[PDB]
Paper text:
Here we report the high-resolution structure of an aviadenovirus, the poultry pathogen fowl adenovirus serotype 4 ([name]-C4). The capsid facets are formed by 240 trimeric hexons, with twelve pentameric pentons at the vertices. Minor coat proteins IIIa, VI and VIII on the inner capsid surface contribute to modulate the quasi-equivalent icosahedral interactions, along with the genus specific outer proteins IX (in mastadenoviruses) or LH3 (in atadenoviruses).
The structure shows the general characteristics common to all previously solved adenovirus structures: hexons (major capsid protein) and penton base (vertex protein) arranged in a pseudo T = 25 icosahedral particle, with inner cementing proteins IIIa and VIII on the inner capsid surface. In agreement with the LC-MS/MS data, no densities that could be interpreted as genus specific minor coat proteins were present in the map. In addition to these expected results, we found that the [name]-C4 hexon presents a unique insertion of fourteen amino acids located at the equator of the hexon trimer. The variable loop (VL, diff 3) is quite long in [name]-C4 (17 vs 6 aa in HAdV-C5) and folds back towards the main body of the monomer, augmenting intramolecular interactions, in sharp contrast to the protruding orientation of the VL in HAdV-C5. The α2 helix in the body domain of HAdV-C5 protein VIII is 22 amino acid long, while its counterpart in [name]-C4 is shorter (13 residues) and followed by a bend of 115º and another 12-residue α-helix (α2’). Additionally, while in the human and lizard viruses the first helix of the VIII-binding domain is roughly perpendicular to the connecting helix, in [name]-C4 this helix adopts an oblique orientation, which results in a completely different conformation of the protein in each one of the genera. Interestingly, the N-terminal region of one monomer in hexon 1 (chain B) interlaces with the divergent neck region of VIII, while the N-terminus of one monomer in hexon 2 (chain F) crosses over the head domain of protein VIII, further securing it in a clasp near the AVP cleavage site (ovals, and 7c). Thus, the long N-terminal tail unique to the aviadenovirus hexon in combination with the different fold of protein VIII could play a stabilizing role in the capsid.
Author numbering:
A (entry chain B): 2 to 99
B (entry chain N): 16 to 259
C (entry chain O): 1 to 115, 174 to 241
D (entry chain B), I (entry chain A): 297 to 346
E (entry chain A): 445 to 790
F (entry chain A): 840 to 937
G (entry chain B): 544 to 592
H (entry chain A): 11 to 99
């Protein structure tokens, strides 16, 4: 019943090293997490178990070619002595949000 | 409208003092919106439902969803009349018919997909966000989902809107309702497990709710709920009670 | 013979051990016989018979499971490992046979240099043996051996002809069209 | 920028609905509003050159 | 100032001693016009003659100033120090019961172990060290043996065992760039990049960088601040641009992300500027500025802003990104004779 | 004269070490970035070339290039005084001279 | 969208002195050559956008 | 848990479980402008059991090298950290 | 200390498991990693003489 | 021109001066959206 | 000469008021200490010097 | 496969030999009918159908 | 052709087992005429030396 | 791309087949046969041959 996984042959190599694993709250045992919570103000083990936040990697940034920065030149200027006007045609394309 | 159920109730009903404990402006806003209800425009949402169904049915791609929806809003508004609005409602009822026809498909597949789909419809059939304890709510929903999936003999159904859950232990089958349980589980998501809350909400939980979350906690993580909530520390006890 | 009726080369899979997700499949060119230029009619039949004698995926699954069972390195402790994991927990912590003095005197105790409760060996082993708090594996990622049990090499005749399955090189199907993507 | 000037204000608007949707009142203080907001979000001794 | 802006003192002769010795630095007076009270008299302007000079090799380096005064005012110090373990696997390891042997070797190189405020060759300056006693201190919690065996047993369980990561999380490669060269190509063999976090890069003087994995570097004759070992980076400027191509011809941004989609134009000259592409009132580009703010502060599409939550970090962008501007007379004109000479007669 | 002056826009940035995230939108979204688990790089081999142009100095310098790697250790102590560490680095597992 | 704005050219408005002197009488002036508008667009997936 | 200690809330139950429930709602409700939470004392009690040995145990141990092997470039030291059972390092 | 050196590294290992568990690579940076870890852990203007 | 100014919506509630609250007048999808994408692209300050 | 010099290691500590916690492990484990409720001192008289 | 070599002063190859079973089966089923079929196990060159 | 085929099972571990162990001396006793060394060959279970 | 073939802590150097190392630079040994060839490489060659 005891768990004896050999590393350097663990096989996922990310889940075992918690680079893309479940998370510290859910891979440490019941009793060890209770122990950490109880004895957590004087003897710290939180830094000794690795946890990684994982990027959403789907439906969050398009592979489509989209410009990060767009410069909008004035279409109408109408410079005067007291002020300087600039008129722009800001276009937020299909699927874009500005 | 809680004003209507505050007038037509006993002397100090729960919503007769919900308005009372509001600030004067909030109470006056509720009173005004009850007395003279503001009208709402159905379109620009029905069109959204139509385009979402079109994308869901594969008719259009989700990349072009918003553009198609806004073009359809142009086509509707420039001819907005009684006769086009009925066509809008016909297309919305069309979307509903398609969704129900799709649902009848998963109720014909393996039961472990049928109950999962019925559970998704149950989740879509109630509130999706709570003011307090949202993490607890979604953790419970995920735990219930994977409990149904990993229990081969769990069967989810509906009886007049009441989504019940059947668990067959061979010699007996204990039925637990989910609608009334989740209704009871309101204002217990943001629980803050401590000395006074436990008596307060230990008498607030019905046997149905305790049975439901007891059965759910058989598959319970420490990363499921808020680390100091009443539901979290209650499932922590119930899981080991199941184990021992 | 007719090459249209000839058995195709099996599709072997790529595991991608680090992410854990399947890396796709390929035509098994790494083990192929050279039979048309040197072989002719006598070896075309032989190569076809070899190709169609490639084991069906169930047989390959059984062979791989049997090969994995003789590993000695199963994920959980066998009798060999669990015996020593019990042995070291038995000889860990304060000894049970140590008769030490408990002095409940509110004045003038003993020094008790040493080297009134104790924990039982059952619970002591229970702490050591219990698994994580997850008790369920995340979808998608698989270990090498669980990937070998599924995802088996198999002959796939006429693969790119059906209604809407195509293949699984590296994709994530989204819009009911097979979108081999993640570019 | 000519803020809080109703006589020389800017104009942000769409095309199909050409109505100008920015109105600047002479009795408001946009620059001081930005000053107070920026001082509330963070301390003012930080020198952000941009 | 750099040695190229200095001259001998009529008694000193070059090639008699190495340029990395103390009395070489003392006996070479700098030119008096390269910097003076009139040097850009009204401009907050770092002296471009020393923009590439290590500023931490200065007697105003308060950290080193404190670190040197902890040993005393004499050069004959009976030092007693406590050095932490810094290897990530054993920096925070929580060893359980058992017998462990743990050996480590300590440097004796004066250039390595000691930091000068001038960066002179300490070996050539007679500096040395002798280690008398090196003992290892360990603190043990006197927790109940009934619970520490429980604690050690829930830590021997394989489902919950210690995991440690190096905080830097970066493979470190040093690519040589000679003096006159202005370009560098970094080609790499075929690889999978299975979880790569990104790129970080500055340029470090080879004279200030020891041989990597060397028992004793003999060509290392510098004792100032090794920018490789510590975070004392000062050459984050002097990067005109950079490009990434995961394949032979596949640019990584490759989606017209940047205003120059095929390269990471870190900076461009404002004098030659015509289209803009310069942000924060300096020569850094719009593309590069967005990259830095997005990386460190996670909000560029909602608006550029200052982020006081990371000013303590001492290695982020906004706290030490210092744009400056001067004007200067335009020489090579009928007047404006440029009466300051920067080349000593050596 | 105004035609007898110039401009010398310049910036210094000490203790920074320019970072570029391997994230599809250049915004931090987890240690294991957006594209670090994108199975176009992870599944498929690639050999990048990085091209620099620098302000020419007068002395030999290196270019301290830091990649982004997940160098983790899973310290396993199954029995008494049985210590075993497993090392794993995700992009550069071989750890050779590159 | 059409978005127009007007820039101040007043030396006293746009420029701050450490003395507060009248800059119009002190020859202060400004000329705008290029006044361009920039924007940042999140490359979020069109499916979710 | 002496009643003398409990009466002064030195070893007593704690604020959340001895104040009147209405008062706890009041002080929390009026906690943003009229703070009353500093007027009812609460003491955090130490575990006082099963957390520390009475065994004579060294709190801080010095390890000195078994082997040194000094050389001109480096100065090796080899230690031997003996961690007994019940000790966690 | 000889960090980052794979030719003159340290050695930590147990008795039952004689294999060395401290392996150092020439392409990692122990010192700079500590500098970045410590600076993120606390402000660097604090002077800790220990 | 909007279908909300045409009706009898209270002015304070319409402009969220004395309204219900962002947790309860936004569509229940939008609260989840702004919460999920709240670490890199925040929308909470716009409601 | 190196034999003609000494060392004078010293520390200044102002506004500190050296403290010794009456705890088992000399660490804060609650305002009421480990030994402050141990029924050796509390229940029996002891006369410290 | 990664190699580190002592740098020499002239261009050199690296003669890499894998381990393969490059075998032949020679069939002569009839008179003056010769036929071979080449097979190499790891790095197969051959006929994919 | 005839090929010798390896056993491939029940002959070699897949466990992480060090193939060559270097035993540091526990205890030395360097003298002028002899140099002693004392080792601890701890052959773990399942290992053969 | 990342699974070292031995990968079971077989070799004294975990992540490579260290053929030779500089004995002058050598500190922990790992050299065989009175030259700079390593213990691991000597083991592999003699086992193979």
């Amino acid at each position: 019943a005891a768990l004896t996984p050999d590393l350097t042959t663990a096989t996922p190599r990310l889940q075992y090293f918690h680079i893309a694993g479940p998370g510290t709250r859910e891979y440490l045992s019941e009793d060890l997490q209770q122990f950490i919570s109880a004895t957590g103000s004087y003897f710290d083990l939180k830094n000794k178990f690795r946890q990684t936040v994982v990027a959403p990697t789907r439906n969050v940034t398009t592979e489509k070619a989209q410009r990060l920065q767009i410069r909008f030149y004035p279409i109408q200027t109408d410079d005067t002595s007291t002020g300087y006007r600039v008129r722009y045609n800001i276009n937020v394309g299909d699927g874009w949000v500005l | 409208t809680e004003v209507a159920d505050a007038l037509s109730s006993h002397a100090n009903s729960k919503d007769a003092r919900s308005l009372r404990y509001e600030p004067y402006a909030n109470r006056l806003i509720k009173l005004q919106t009850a007395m003279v209800p503001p009208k709402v425009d159905g379109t620009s949402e029905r069109v959204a439902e139509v385009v979402k169904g079109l994308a869901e049915q594969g008719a259009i791609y989700p990349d072009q969803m918003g553009a198609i929806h806004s073009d359809l809003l142009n086509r509707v508004y420039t001819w907005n009349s009684m006769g086009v609005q009925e066509s809008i409602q016909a297309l919305v009822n069309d979307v509903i018919h398609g969704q129900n026809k799709v649902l009848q498909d998963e109720l014909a597949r393996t039961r472990e997909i049928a109950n999962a789909s019925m559970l998704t419809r149950f989740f879509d059939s109630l509130y999706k966000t709570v003011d307090r304890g949202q993490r607890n709510f979604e953790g419970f929903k995920k735990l219930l989902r994977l409990f149904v999936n990993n229990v081969p003999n769990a069967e989810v159904y509906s009886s007049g809107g009441s989504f019940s859950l059947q668990i067959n232990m061979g010699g007996q089958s204990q039925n637990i309702n989910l609608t009334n349980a989740f209704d009871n589980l309101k204002d217990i998501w943001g629980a803050r497990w401590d000395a006074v809350n436990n008596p307060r909400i230990g008498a607030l939980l019905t046997p149905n709710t305790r049975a439901l979350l007891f059965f759910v906690s058989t598959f319970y993580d420490y990363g499921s709920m808020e680390p100091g909530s009443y539901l979290d520390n209650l499932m922590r006890l119930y899981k080991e009670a199941i184990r021992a | 013979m007719n090459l249209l009726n000839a058995a195709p080369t099996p599709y072997v899979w790529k595991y991608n051990p680090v992410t854990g997700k399947c890396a796709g499949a390929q035509q098994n060119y790494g083990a192929t016989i050279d039979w048309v230029l040197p072989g002719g009619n006598s070896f075309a039949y032989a190569a076809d018979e070899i190709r169609r004698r490639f084991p069906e995926p169930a047989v390959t699954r059984a062979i791989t499971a049997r090969f994995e069972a003789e590993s000695d390195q199963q994920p959980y402790a066998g009798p060999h490992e669990t015996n020593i994991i019990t042995a070291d927990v038995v000889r860990s912590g304060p000894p049970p046979s140590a008769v030490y003095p408990f002095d409940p005197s509110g004045v003038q105790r003993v020094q008790l240099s040493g080297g009134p409760e104790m924990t039982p060996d059952a619970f002591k082993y229970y702490l050591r043996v219990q698994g994580p708090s997850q008790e369920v594996d995340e979808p998608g990622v698989m270990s090498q051996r669980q990937f070998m049990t599924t995802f088996l090499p198999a002959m796939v005749p006429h693969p790119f002809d059906s209604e809407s399955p195509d293949a699984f090189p590296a994709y994530f199907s989204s819009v009911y069209k097979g979108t081999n993507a993640f570019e | 920028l000519y803020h809080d000037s109703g006589v020389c204000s800017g104009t942000l608007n769409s095309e199909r609905s050409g109505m100008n949707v920015v109105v600047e009142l002479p009795d408001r203080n946009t620059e001081l509003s930005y000053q107070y907001m920026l001082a509330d979000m963070m301390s003012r001794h930080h020198y952000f050159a941009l | 100032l750099p040695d190229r802006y200095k001259f001998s003192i009529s008694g000193f002769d070059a090639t008699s001693v190495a340029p990395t010795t103390y009395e070489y630095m003392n006996k070479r007076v700098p030119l008096t016009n390269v910097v003076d009270m009139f040097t850009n008299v009204g401009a907050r302007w770092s002296i471009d003659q020393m923009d590439n000079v290590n500023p931490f090799n200065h007697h105003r380096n308060w950290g080193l100033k404190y670190r040197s005064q902890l040993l005393g005012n004499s050069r004959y110090v009976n030092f007693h120090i406590q050095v932490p373990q810094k290897f990530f696997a054993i920096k925070n390891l929580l060893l359980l019961s058992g017998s462990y042997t743990y050996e480590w070797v300590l440097r004796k190189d004066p250039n390595m172990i000691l930091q000068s405020s001038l960066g002179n060759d300490l070996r050539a300056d007679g500096a040395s060290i002798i280690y008398n006693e090196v003992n290892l201190m360990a603190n043990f919690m006197p927790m109940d043996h009934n619970t520490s065996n429980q604690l050690e047993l829930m830590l021997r369980n394989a489902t919950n065992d210690q995991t440690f990561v190096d905080y830097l999380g970066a493979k470190n490669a040093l690519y040589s760039v000679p003096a006159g060269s202005t370009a560098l190509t970094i080609n790499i063999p075929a690889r999978t990049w299975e979880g790569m976090r990104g790129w970080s890069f500055t340029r470090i003087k080879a004279a200030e960088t020891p041989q990597l994995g060397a028992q004793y570097d003999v060509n290392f004759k510098y004792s100032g601040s090794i920018a490789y070992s510590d975070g004392g980076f000062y050459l984050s400027h002097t990067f005109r641009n950079m490009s990434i191509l995961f394949d032979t011809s596949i640019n990584w941004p490759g989606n017209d992300r940047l205003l120059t989609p095929n390269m990471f134009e870190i900076k461009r000259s404002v004098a030659l500027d015509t289209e803009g592409f310069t942000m924060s009132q300096c020569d850094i580009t719009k593309d590069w500025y967005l990259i830095q703010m997005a990386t460190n502060y996670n909000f560029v599409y909602n608006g550029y802003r200052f982020w006081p939550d990371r000013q303590y970090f001492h290695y982020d962008f906004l706290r030490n990104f210092d744009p400056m501007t001067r004007q200067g007379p335009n020489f090579a004109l009928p007047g404006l004779f440029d009466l300051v000479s920067y080349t000593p007669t050596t | 004269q105004p035609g007898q002056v110039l401009s010398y826009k310049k910036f210094l940035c000490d203790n920074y070490l320019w970072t570029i995230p391997f994230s599809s939108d250049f915004m931090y979204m987890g240690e294991l970035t957006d594209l670090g688990q994108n199975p176009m790089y992870t599944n498929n081999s690639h050999s990048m070339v990085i091209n620099f142009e620098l302000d020419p100095m007068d002395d030999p310098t290196y270019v301290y290039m830091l990649y982004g790697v997940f160098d983790t250790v899973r310290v396993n102590q199954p029995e008494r005084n049985v210590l075993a560490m497993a090392y794993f680095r995700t992009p550069f597992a071989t750890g050779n001279a590159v």
